[PDB]
Structures are given as C-alpha cells and as structure tokens.
C-alpha cells in the first residue's frame, strides 16, 4: 500500500519541531542526488554504445 | 407510468406536442427593452379553391415581439385545429 500522502510533514509538526525542515530539505537533497546518478547511468549507457 | 422496467423517458408529451422550451435570456432581453406594443390585426381567409384548408381565424399580434418564431405559433395553431 504505497501511500503518497504520508511522505509529507506539512505544517503542524514542522512549526513545533524545527528540525523537520532540516529533515525535509535533507530528503530533497537526496532526491536531486539520486537523479544525478540517473543522468549518470544514461550517460554510461550512451558512451559505451557510442564506442 | 412509473412502475415499469426502468427506462429513461425524456418528456412524455401531452397529446402529440413536445413542451415549449423557453430561452430565458431573450425573454429578459426583450422584457426590459419594452417601450411599446403596437398590436397588429391579422386576417386569415382560405377556401376549398386555390387552398385545401379554410382557416378563417382572426388574431391580434405584437409587432415588437421578437421572442416567438411565427412558424412555431402557426404550427401550434394547426395542431390546435386537429389537422
């Protein structure tokens, strides 16, 4: 049951606990890291196929 | 009759005529620009020669009325005369 709803700590907890922003922009900092791996993989599928 | 096998019956007519559906915007566009009336005396005479019907009815009619299409009123009148 992959619920997309409960990946968000929207307002009521982040205002009370300020570390959650430091959590949340952590996760976003991961989400552009793995994508950088993804554009890496499509790079490495390219150049070998180039050669 | 409602006690049936659950069809959809749009507008079961009285006699043989579909209900007159208004415009409700041209009615307000005409009823607010409503200066005068100018009734028109209208005469209808037809014989068994050069025509088949007789139709000797006389009526008034508003000349400034742009709501009712005249062919619809004549088609309602002929249905009222049981043609």
């Amino acid at each position: 049951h992959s619920h997309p709803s409960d990946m968000v700590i929207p307002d009521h907890l982040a205002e009370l606990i300020p570390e959650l922003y430091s959590f949340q922009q952590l996760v976003d900092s991961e989400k552009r890291l793995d994508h950088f791996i993804h554009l890496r993989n499509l790079h490495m599928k390219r150049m070998v196929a180039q050669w | 009759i409602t006690n049936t096998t659950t069809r959809v019956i749009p507008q079961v007519e009285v006699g043989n005529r579909k209900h007159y559906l208004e415009d409700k915007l041209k009615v307000y566009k005409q009823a607010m620009n409503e200066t005068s009336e100018q009734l028109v005396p209208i005469r209808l005479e037809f014989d068994q020669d050069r025509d088949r019907f007789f139709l000797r009815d006389t009526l008034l009619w508003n000349k400034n009325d742009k709501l009712i299409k005249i062919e619809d009123f004549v088609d309602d009148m002929l249905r009222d005369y049981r043609f």
């Binding site: 997309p4 | 579909k18 007159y20 559906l21 619809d72």
Partner: protein, 106 residues
C-alpha cells in the same frame, strides 16, 4: 475517422425540434466520440488514496485511540514526580554522532 471541427457545429447536428453528407459525418462522429469518451467499466476505479478512504474504519480506530489514550491519562495512578522522562536520543543515534563527530575533522 478523426472526423472534423465542422461536424461538431450546431448546424450539422440535431437540436430540440418541436442531408446525405450530414448523415455520413454524424456516423463517424458518433463512432469516434463514443469509443473516446466512454467510461472505464472495469477496475482501477480507486483513482487515488482519498476515494477508497473508509469513514467507518477511521471512526473505529479513533474510538479506540481516544479510549486507550484517556485510560493512559486518568487511570495510570503514577504521580507527577514519579513519571520518568524518556531519552531524547537512542542507543544508535548516540553512536552515530560519536562516529561522525570523530570523523568531522577531515
């Protein structure tokens, strides 16, 4: 098919009353826009999370979750001086922050 924009006009189509090219175009129009606009009569009728949400199960879970949390409040006869505080860190979060602070000088 993929009929026209002229076939969608009100002149070539029927209205509340009270030729051959029109009756040829309205065949393709009703054969195109009834295989396109027809609803799905099968599964994947869930569409999202917030349509198959159940009010009865959530109401039952909230009835349990209020009752036991109120029995946690009143019936627990531990005095306020005797309620021992919980740890703000774990046995693993206290190891990782000893490790990373050791490795922070690189």
């Amino acid at each position: 098919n993929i009929p026209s924009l002229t076939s969608f006009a009100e002149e070539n189509n029927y209205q509340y009353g009270y030729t051959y090219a029109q009756q040829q175009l309205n065949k393709q129009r009703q054969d195109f826009e009834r295989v396109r606009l027809r609803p799905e009569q099968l599964s994947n009728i869930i569409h999202d999370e917030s349509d198959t949400i159940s009010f009865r199960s959530n109401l039952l879970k909230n009835f349990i979750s209020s009752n036991d949390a109120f029995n946690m409040l009143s019936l627990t006869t531990v005095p306020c001086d005797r309620i021992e505080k919980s740890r703000l860190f774990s046995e693993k979060t206290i190891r990782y922050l000893m490790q990373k602070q050791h490795e922070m000088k690189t």
